[PDB]
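Q: I have four molecules that I believe assemble together. Could you output structure tokens for the complex as a whole instead of separate predictions?
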Amino acid sequence: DGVGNASGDWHCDSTWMGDRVVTKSTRTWVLPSYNNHQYREIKSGSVDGSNANAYFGYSTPWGYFDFNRFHSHWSPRDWQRLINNYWGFRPRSLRVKIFNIQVK
Amino acid sequence: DGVGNASGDWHCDSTWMGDRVVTKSTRTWVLPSYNNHQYREIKSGSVDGSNANAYFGYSTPWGYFDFNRFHSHWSPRDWQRLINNYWGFRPRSLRVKIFNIQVKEVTVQDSTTTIANNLTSTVQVFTDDDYQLPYVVGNGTEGCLPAFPPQVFTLPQYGYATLNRDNGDNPTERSSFFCLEYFPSKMLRTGNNFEFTYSFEEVPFHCSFAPSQNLFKLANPLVDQYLYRFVSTSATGAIQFQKNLAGRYANTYKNWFPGPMGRTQGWNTSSGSSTNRVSVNNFSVSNRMNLEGASYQVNPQPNGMTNTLQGSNRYALENTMIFNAQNATPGTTSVYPEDNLLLTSESETQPVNRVAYNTGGQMATNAQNATTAPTVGTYNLQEVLPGSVWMERDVYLQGPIWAKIPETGAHFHPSPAMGGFGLKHPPPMMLIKNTPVPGNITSFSDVPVSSFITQYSTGQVTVEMEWELKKENSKRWNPEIQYTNNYNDPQFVDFAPDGSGEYRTTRAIGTRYLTRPL
Amino acid sequence: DGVGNASGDWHCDSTWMGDRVVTKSTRTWVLPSYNNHQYREIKSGSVDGSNANAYFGYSTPWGYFDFNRFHSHWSPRDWQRLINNYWGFRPRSLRVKIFNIQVK
Amino acid sequence: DGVGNASGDWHCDSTWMGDRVVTKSTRTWVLPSYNNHQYREIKSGSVDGSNANAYFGYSTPWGYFDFNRFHSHWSPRDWQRLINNYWGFRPRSLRVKIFNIQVKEVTVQDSTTTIANNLTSTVQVFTDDDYQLPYVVGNGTEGCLPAFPPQVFTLPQYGYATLNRDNGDNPTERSSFFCLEYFPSKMLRTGNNFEFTYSFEEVPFHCSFAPSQNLFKLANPLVDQYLYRFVSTSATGAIQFQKNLAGRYANTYKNWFPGPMGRTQGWNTSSGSSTNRVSVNNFSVSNRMNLEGASYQVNPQPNGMTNTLQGSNRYALENTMIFNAQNATPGTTSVYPEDNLLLTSESETQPVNRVAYNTGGQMATNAQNATTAPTVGTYNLQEVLPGSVWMERDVYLQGPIWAKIPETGAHFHPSPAMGGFGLKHPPPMMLIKNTPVPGNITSFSDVPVSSFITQYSTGQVTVEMEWELKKENSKRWNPEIQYTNNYNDPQFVDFAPDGSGEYRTTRAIGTRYLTRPL
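A: Yes, here they are, computed for all four components at once.
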């Protein structure tokens, strides 16, 4: 759209609504240029005296987003407020969004 | 929207429209990057030999907007035009707006700083609407829109003290940490603008009038009272009475009583310096309250008193609000004489409030027998009594507008000791910070990045308040007292910039000029 | 109504429903015949060396129901569940009922 | 309703209607006043030299109704008529009803007891519909509606063990106390009646058929397999193969495997007593599991085994269900010989489950070289393997109907080790107690009253279940085996009262009589 116009806002909260809670977290990230824009065949032989440490694979120039830890969605006070009052929970939805990019 | 298109205009005026006046002020601000985008746990132990100075809290990387001073909305000539014509006023609305933002990227590369402007950087902004954060706006703290429109100001850093333990710099299990990123902000790039509106709850008008009748001289001085009074005892122990004549107010029966009082000490200003006792450290001999095992000075004491008696140079300094003519720099521990200081005087209340350096009265200390004689005992403090009346402290152009009432649950007469309006839900706090932009990172590390590009932001802020006025309708015949520009041999004009361009203000203009028959 | 038919049931529970909680307590009471069905003028002089303990009044043959203690409506686990999650409360209604009487 | 009007009738019958049978049983019960209307904290330390016998819990003043035994719904002749004609069944509904209550007031005044009936006394009754209380119905505990309709029974007392600490009689911080008065009951006086209905979730039918084919003899005994098998190695180390001929089931390739197994010890019954080792205290040498530092005997072991091999007298006693012909009194610590005991035998499963006193198999212990020879190692326990099949324990007339599956979250194949149906939401527990009536109190005391009138209650209970049946459709030619009344020189009739009026039952009738080609 435009240079001098923000792509999104900072939403970061929690909203308990009965049998559902919606959490929201925003964060700032930085992405390096890995492998100078190349693919490299990474490989290792047996290290530590264990051939189970010997692998063969590929490192790419990409980076990824990982939201697989609880403390990325819950504050310590909203966690506590959950484990003291409920008998269980399970995730229902997800909705990621990337914005306000800046290449330097 | 766009880079080469202004987000808003500069509105700065006043508009009187009968019983309402709408003021508007725009100003330019600058926001530094505080704490390098981090939160720090600030703490202090007992300093100055007083463990009341020992705290524990957190300084954040945010700055806030403070519009809690009258001279941020009123010019000296519109203030004067208010205190000379109305009997009171109260705020009705508010409407802040931030626009024309500009983020600048500073670079000291090569021992030489180069300021370039970043067009993609943002600024974060949110208003605390539910009062979930520690309020710090109504405590007489610096950092408010300057008095003079041309002046540019830096936004002050947000921070707060929370519970500390045993008057030390350690926390308790109840000490709380508030994360401000845990609130939904709005992000702004150079082309965006932020708006926000608010409306005050009903609050009673401030009374900008002085009483023209003594509280203990309300009776007619021509007619006598149909009540008698015990005057003495005869040689036979028999009690004798006498009628209350007219004009003898020392003996009349009263209906209303003056208000609360708490004796402070009185010090004579210049003229009488000779009288004041020499070299006295007030701390040791000041009025202090204890809260959790620590002694705090309670200046300016609770409402219901007059720091001075009109016609004298003596002053109850601890019951006084003391401002400064020439603005000062942060961290100054210099000792100043009265000269460049504006000592406010609340004597236009003397007809109803009691002097703070005299004994409040005398009462009985015993019971008279055929043996013991009647004895009296002067008291120094008396609190609220049923059927008492007092007048609240006055507001000044350079003083605070409102205060937030602590939500403890129980309180009596919510009127801030520093003047202004006490509010349950005061104007929300508006925080703002520069979203951080990382330096050149080159490898993963589960450790957070600490290298940031140094930046700062500038912009404009317009705040438009609406006030309600109370028209004066007096049938006074002779002329009243007004606030007038009465100077003699002026070497400079007051309320105006001097040779260098620095704004001067040698007077503290209050509000009580008009009068009213009690 | 009838001898061999119960006047009411035993309801004793709590029911949290958002911003309202309704508690219910049933109990068995016993009522003695006080003062043999008479009114007596009870009175005392200064006792313990304090004339503030000296009174004059009347004891009646009646008994009364007192529900003025919190633990008459709340269990320790419902109290805890309240003081850990709310910022305040206030009573809204009341509804007493006496039944299944038996004179011996 | 009324005193002189019956609350319900006596329905007790069965009604076969195709693929459904509805049974109905009424019985008279008596309810004592347990614990004098109080709750007591019952606790035990390690007894018998085993800290697994150490618990901590609470005994309440309530009694409960237990309909968890087959012979509470089926007569011996309707059971027989089921196991001889159907391939399976499963419960569909339930409908309990309590009526014709009578509270009696006992009085021992003057060393002479006088039983008078109180017409105003109540009885409290509630069903635990949400499973909020500790379930105690499905654990093989006494107290169920008697087998014979004429018999009157006392309701057993409710109680439960909760968490104890370090295998001692003390509680933990997690030990919970459940107040049963904290549930909304219903009160009943002599003229009232209580009703309650329930419907089972889908549960798979019980399989009342025995297999008529060995699991490892499913192949055609006339045709050979097109698969070969490594038979030996030549002098040159070269591997040699041979085809799988017809009828040689020891060598055929199999597709399915027998089920889990865990070796227990085997003891010979009477005939072979001579063989059994003399004087052995089993506890020390029994199969035991450890849970929190304590050793518990796991009788009757998990499903997937046969306690005996048809044609032998040897028995895997720890994998067996042992009932008693003649009902016994509480607290009996007498040692009994096999005579009056009904040892159930699960041999009609031998074609598919493995014997519990033999080694489950042999596998390889090493790797053969030009040096080492191939070695095998017999194993005693093997758990579930992919592609295994087994048959569950059978149900008996005198055995349990259902069990409640613990709501931990994770479980594998929910089938109770004691037979029956495993249920997530089993028939609610129905508790009942006599509302207390105070003695002669005469003065206030903030202390609770402890003087109560001694009372007891009697009444009727009708429970009507509906079952679904699975019709047998076999094309077997020759005749099958049926359960028959085969006695020789009967000195009494079985399943009928003897001279004194005491009900006799010398057999344990199971369910597996019909057959099915695997």
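A: One point stands out. Residues 76-83 of chain C form the longest helix (8 residues).
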